[PDB]
Paper text:
The results demonstrated that CHMFL-074 adopted a typical type II binding mode (DFG-out conformation) to ABL1, which was represented by two canonical hydrogen bonds formed between the Glu286 located in the c-Helix and Asp381 located in the DFG motif with the amide bond (NHC=O) in the drug. However, superimposition of CHMFL-074 with Imatinib revealed a distinct hinge binding. CHMFL-074 used oxygen atom of carbonyl group connecting the terminal pyridine and piperidine ring to form the hinge binding hydrogen bonds with Met318, while Imatinib used the terminal pyridine ring's N atom to form this hinge binding. In addition, Imatinib formed an extra hydrogen bond between the aminopyrimidine's NH in the drug with the gatekeeper residue Thr315. However, CHMFL-074 used O-linked piperidine ring to replace this aminopyrimidine ring and abolished this hydrogen bond. The relatively rare binding mode of CHMFL-074, which uses carbonyl oxygen as the hinge binding, also highlights the new features of this type II compound. Further confirmation with Invitrogen Z'LYTE biochemical assay (activity-based assay) revealed an IC50 of 25 nM against ABL1 kinase. In addition, it also potently inhibited ABL1's mutants such as E255K, F317L, F317I, M351T, Q252H, Y253F but weakly inhibited H396P and almost lost the activity against the gatekeeper mutation T315I.
Author numbering: 225 to 388, 394 to 499
Write the structure that this text describes.
């Protein structure tokens, strides 16, 4: 080791081997960059921090959790540089970028209703895995999902949410946040389930904004009154039923991600 210690972390990579390219989205997505891992001529994505102003503890924790996560539908950690600044987390680069823009911009003949269902199933799978691990995503939404080759979809976290092609709701995603989370700041797997229902709606609509035309300040009250978004055109009724289950007021009454993944397989008869 450079530090002369016998402790080591295999994930820690040499920063000299990374070439830092342009910020993704030209800065709309925070401190995330395209980069090249020169050793493999491999395009990669790199997240960094600005440490004087940012929470280093949170970054280190993020790096740590990512080391524990392996699934086909979860973004793949490649390495970290977390001994000293600048701090980096390095992941795979997903060719087609975030799901929200992809839905908005896609050819609907290719990306038809069936493909939308496939995207949902893939996300369901990822969430089932996180649930088993007892990890809470805390910011599930289309903007945080990624699209790869072969219509592959992965759950990720850009890290923009501040809750303690614009994407206006990225910082304060009130429209994705369960009522208990809003009122009492309780975030849980069950609150992720609520968000998942919103994400299903985003998918079903090809990326429309939720609760269209409704002010942020009126969302909680509407939910409390037992109002919910309507079934999208072309959304299968069974999928809508699932969304509605995800949006039960009491968290206890929402399905588990295990049940949700099971429902998808079963629901259309096989
Ligand atoms: C560079 C980078 C580093 C780390 C991350 N971190 C994660 O995605 C991430 C972090 C924590 C976690 C999990 N935690 C989430 C927070 N919870 C409180 C705890 C659990 C996850 C996941 F939910 F998937 F398990 C993902 C994302 C990063 O960048 C993202 C994903 C990769 N990117 C692309 O593939 C990309 C995006 C847009 C255009 N081109 C490529 C860029 C944006
Ligand atoms: C942009 C925004 C829009 C709406 C809301 N919240 C609500 O509309 C809302 C939430 C709970 C509630 C209801 N609760 C009010 C509080 N009671 C203890 C429980 C019931 C209501 C309402 F009063 F109408 F019923 C409304 C919060 C919003 O933002 C806050 C900013 C501060 N928050 C932060 O996480 C935060 C704080 C400090 C630094 N960074 C983020 C929480 C989200
Ligand atoms: Cl800084």
């Amino acid at each position: 080791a450079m530090g002369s210690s016998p402790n080591y972390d295999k994930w820690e990579m040499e920063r000299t081997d990374i070439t830092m390219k342009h910020k993704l989205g030209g800065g709309q997505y925070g401190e995330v960059y395209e980069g090249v891992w020169k050793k493999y001529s491999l395009t990669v994505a790199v997240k960094t921090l600005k440490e004087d102003t940012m929470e280093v503890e949170e970054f280190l924790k993020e790096a740590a959790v990512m080391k524990e996560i392996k699934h086909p539908n979860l973004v793949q950690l490649l390495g970290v540089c977390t001994r000293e600044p600048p701090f980096y987390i390095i992941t795979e680069f997903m060719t087609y970028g975030n799901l929200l823009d992809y839905l908005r911009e896609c050819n609907r003949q290719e990306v038809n209703a069936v493909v939308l269902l496939y995207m949902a199933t893939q996300i369901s799978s990822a969430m089932e895995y996180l649930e088993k691990k007892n990890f809470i995503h805390r910011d599930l939404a289309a903007r945080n999902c990624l699209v790869g080759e072969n219509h592959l979809v992965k759950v990720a976290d850009f890290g923009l949410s501040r809750l303690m092609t614009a994407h206006a709701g990225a910082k304060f995603p009130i429209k994705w946040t369960a009522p208990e989370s809003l009122a009492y700041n309780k975030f849980s797997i069950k609150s992720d389930v609520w968000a998942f229902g919103v994400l299903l709606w985003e998918i079903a609509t090809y990326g429309m904004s939720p609760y269209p035309g409704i002010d942020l300040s009126q969302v909680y009250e509407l939910l409390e009154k037992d109002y919910r978004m309507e079934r999208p055109e072309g959304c299968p009724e069974k999928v809508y039923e699932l969304m509605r289950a995800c949006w039960q007021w009491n968290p206890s009454d929402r399905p588990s991600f295990a049940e949700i993944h099971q429902a998808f397989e079963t629901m259309f008869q096989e």
